[PDB]
Design a binder for this molecule. Sequence first.
Ligand SMILES: Nc1nc2c(ncn2[C@@H]2O[C@H](COP(=O)(O)OP(=O)(O)OP(=O)(O)O)[C@@H](O)[C@H]2O)c(=O)[nH]1
Ligand SMILES: Nc1nc2c(ncn2[C@@H]2O[C@H](COP(=O)(O)OP(=O)(O)O)[C@@H](O)[C@H]2O)c(=O)[nH]1
Ligand SMILES: [Mg+2]
Ligand SMILES: [Mg+2]
Lengths: 430, 433
Amino acid sequence: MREIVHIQAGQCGNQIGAKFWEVISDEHGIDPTGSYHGDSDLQLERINVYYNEAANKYVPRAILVDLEPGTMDSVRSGPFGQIFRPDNFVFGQSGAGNNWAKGHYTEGAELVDSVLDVVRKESESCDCLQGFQLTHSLGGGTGSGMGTLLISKIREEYPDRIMNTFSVVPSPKVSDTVVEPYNATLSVHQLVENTDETYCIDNEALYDICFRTLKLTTPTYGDLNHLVSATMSGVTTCLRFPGQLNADLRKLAVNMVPFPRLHFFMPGFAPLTSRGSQQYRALTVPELTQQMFDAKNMMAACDPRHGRYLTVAAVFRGRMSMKEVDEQMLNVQNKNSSYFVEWIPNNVKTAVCDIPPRGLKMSATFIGNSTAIQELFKRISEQFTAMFRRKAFLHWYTGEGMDEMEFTEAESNMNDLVSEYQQYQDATAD
Amino acid sequence: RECISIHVGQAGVQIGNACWELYCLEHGIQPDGQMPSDKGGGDSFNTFFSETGAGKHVPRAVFVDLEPTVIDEVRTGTYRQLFHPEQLITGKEDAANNYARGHYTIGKEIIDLVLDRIRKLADQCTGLQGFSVFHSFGGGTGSGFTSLLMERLSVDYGKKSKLEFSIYPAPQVSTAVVEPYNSILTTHTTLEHSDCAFMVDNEAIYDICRRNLDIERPTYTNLNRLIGQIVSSITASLRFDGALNVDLTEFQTNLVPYPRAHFPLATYAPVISAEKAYQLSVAEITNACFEPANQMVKCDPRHGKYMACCLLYRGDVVPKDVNAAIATIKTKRTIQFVDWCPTGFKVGINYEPPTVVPGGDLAKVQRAVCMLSNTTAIAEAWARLDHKFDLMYAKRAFVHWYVGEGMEEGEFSEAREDMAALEKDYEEVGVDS
Ligand SMILES: Nc1nc2c(ncn2[C@@H]2O[C@H](COP(=O)(O)OP(=O)(O)OP(=O)(O)O)[C@@H](O)[C@H]2O)c(=O)[nH]1
Ligand SMILES: Nc1nc2c(ncn2[C@@H]2O[C@H](COP(=O)(O)OP(=O)(O)O)[C@@H](O)[C@H]2O)c(=O)[nH]1
Ligand SMILES: [Mg+2]
Ligand SMILES: [Mg+2]
C-alpha cells in the first residue's frame, strides 16, 4: 500500500489533472524540470506515492488519455507539461463527440489496449501498488465513456487494488451539450459498481461558489478548476504526508464506506480563496470548523441539512492547536447530533498536517459520506428522464452499438442508489 | 481533421467558387495557391487545404458536373491554378432538370470516376472528418447525381459524416418547372444518408439582397456571395482555432434530436450594403437573428417550437455582451421550446472579423452572427414543395420524362409518402406531454 497510479481522461480529466499536478509538485518542492528545490524533509518522506525516480529527478506516476490530441498539446505547452513521461501520453486522433457510447464502446475500446500497456508499465516499477486514481467528467464523451471502460478494465486486471475517482458533475449552468444527463447517468451506473470511492465534484456547486461567494460575474473553467485543484490537494493530504489516520486508500475506504454502493463523497474545504494573491483573514480553528460544515463550501450541490452524515473525514493543515481542534470537532457533533448517524459510533475522524497549502497558513478539507448526495442524483435523474421519455438524441448512442435497455438499467440503478441513500437516512438506533 | 467539400451541378459548383474565394481571402491564400511565410503562427485551416511539397495550398474540394460549361469557367478564370485538374470532373451530356437522368441514366456513367477522385483526396488525409456536399434541389445533377453520390459514400465511407448545403428552389430564379419533383425525389433518397442539411431558400437570399443590399434583380453572383458568407460562418469553426470557438460537430449534437429532423434554419446578420456610412452592437445583431426577414428559409418560427438554438458569433464579440443580449431576448421575445428540451442557447465565438469580397456588395463589419436553430417551422418549406408536387403529380404531368429514364413511377409515390411522414414527424415533435 504505497504507490498510487494516477490517470486523467478526456478534456476535463486532463485539465483538472494537470492543475492538480502543478499544485502538489509545488507543495512537494518540485520544479517543472523535475528537480527537488524544497526545504522540509516531510515533502520527500512519502514522495514515492505519486512520483518515481530517474536515477535525473522526480517524475509523476501519471497517465494522460484522450481520444482528441487537442488537450495533449495544451498540457505539454503548460508550465509543468515537460515533467510528464513522453510515453505516458496515450492519445487517439478521432474524438468522442461528447458521446459516452463512443468512448466506452466504439472508439475508446480501440484505444484502451494502448492505455493498459502504459498502466502495466507503471505498475511493474511499483514495489507494492496501492491503488489507482482517475480524474474525468461524467457529462462528456471520453472521460465519461472511456474512463468508465478504463475503470472496468483496470478492475479485471487489478482486482486487488483500490479504484478511486475524481468525477465532476455536469450542470446546465456550465454545460457544453444536452446529452450530458445521458452520459452522467450511464457513467454513474458504472461508478456505483466499479469504484471503491468517488469524490463528487459538482460543477453547479463550483459555479455557485465562484458566482455567489467569490463574486465573479462570469466564471471561467480556470475559476472552477482552481477550486478543484485545491479540493484535490486536501483530500490527498493524508496520502502523501506522514500521517496516522487514513494513510492509504483502503484504510480510508474502510472508514468512509459502510455499504459498497454508497461510496460517493461530498468534498468541501475552507477558506474559499479566489484566484488572487492571498487573503488576510487568517482564520481561527473555530472558523475553519464552521466553514467546513457549511453548505456554501461544499463542492456538491447538496444541503447537508437535508441528509445525515454516515461517515466524515476532516483534514486540517497548518500549525494549530490540535487540542483546540478536538474541542471544535467534538462540539459540531454533539451540537448537531441529528445530522450524524447514531448507529455508527465515532464516524467522524480528524487528521492534522503541519504543512499548509502554498498561499495559506491554515486550511481544512472536508470529506463527507452524506445521504444528502441523493439530491445530486435526483437532479441528474430528473434531466435524464425529461429527454428519455421521448427518446431524444438516443440515435447517437444506439448508432454506436448501445441497446435502448442499457439506458433503462442505468436509470433504474441510479434511482435505486437514491432510494438506498434515503433508506439509511431514515434508519434509527432504537 | 480534414474535410472534403463536394460541389455538384451548376449551383454547387458556382457556390463553391464564391466559398473557396472567400476561404482564400480569410486565410490569406493567393489564387496560385501560395501564402507568405509564417514568420508556427497558428496555421486549423489545413482541415480544408492540403500542402504540396512546393508550398502550394490546394483545396480539399471536388467539382462535379454532367456538363463541362460551368467547370470550364473555373479552369479558365482566376482560380485555374488553385485546383488540380483531377478535381474538376465533367461529363458531356447533362441531366436536363431530370432527377432520373442524373441518378439513373447519365449519372451512373460517371459515378465510378467521381468516387475514384474522391478516394484520392481521402487517401491524402491523415484523419478524415466528413464530407460537405453542395447541390441544388431542382437541377437534374444537383438532385439526381447528388443522391446517387450520397448512397455510395454511405457504403464506402460509412463511418464518416456527411453535411449538405442544399439550394431550395424559388420561382424568381427557377430554371425548370419540374423542380418540385426533383426536390421531393432527392430529399427522399438522401434523407437516410445525410447527417445535417442546411437548406438555402433562393427566395430568402433573393429578397435579402433586394431589401438589405438594394439590388433590383439580384444575379446569381449576388446570391452566391451572400450564401458564401453564411457557409463561411458555419465552417469557420473547423477552419480556425479559438479558446471559445466551439467546433461545428459539437453543435450538431444539439441541432439533431432525431435522425430525420436534421434540417436546421440558418439566420445571418448583419447584411449591409456598401453605399452609406453605418456599427451594430452584439444585442442588435442577436435581435436580428429572430427577425424572419433575416432567415435563409422563408418560414415563421413563432408559428413553431424550437428544439435547439446556436449562436455562431464572429468578430469583436465579448461573452458577457452575448449573455446580456440573450437574457434580454429570452425575456422580450416568444421563443417556444418543446417541453423535452433544455431551453439553453449554445454560443461559439471566433474573434476574426467577417471577410467580404473586395469591391463586392457586402460591407466589412466589426462583428456578425449566424444563428443555427432547429425549429418545427421549417416544415412550412416542405409543405410548399409538397403542394406544388401534389398539383402536378395528381395529373401525372411530366412523369413520362422520369419514367423514360430508368425510374419506376412508384418511386414518385414512395418519395411523397416519405415527405408526408416527414411532415407528421415535425408535427409530432412539437407536441408536449
Ligand atoms: N444561389 C444559386 N442558385 C443556383 C445557381 N445556379 C443554379 N441555381 C439554382 O439551381 C436550380 C437548378 O439546378 P442547377 O444546379 O442549375 O442544375 P444542375 O445541377 O446543373 O443539373 P442539370 O443542369 O439538370 O444537369 C435552380 O432553381 C436555380 O435557382 C447559383 O449559381 N446560385
Ligand atoms: N470543472 C471543469 N469542467 C469541465 C472542464 N472541461 C470540461 N468540463 C465539463 O465536462 C463536460 C464535457 O466533457 P469533456 O471533458 O469536455 O469531454 P471529453 O473530453 O470527451 O471527456 C461538460 O459538462 C463540462 O462542464 C474543466 O476544465 N473544468
Ligand atoms: Mg468538451
Ligand atoms: Mg448544369
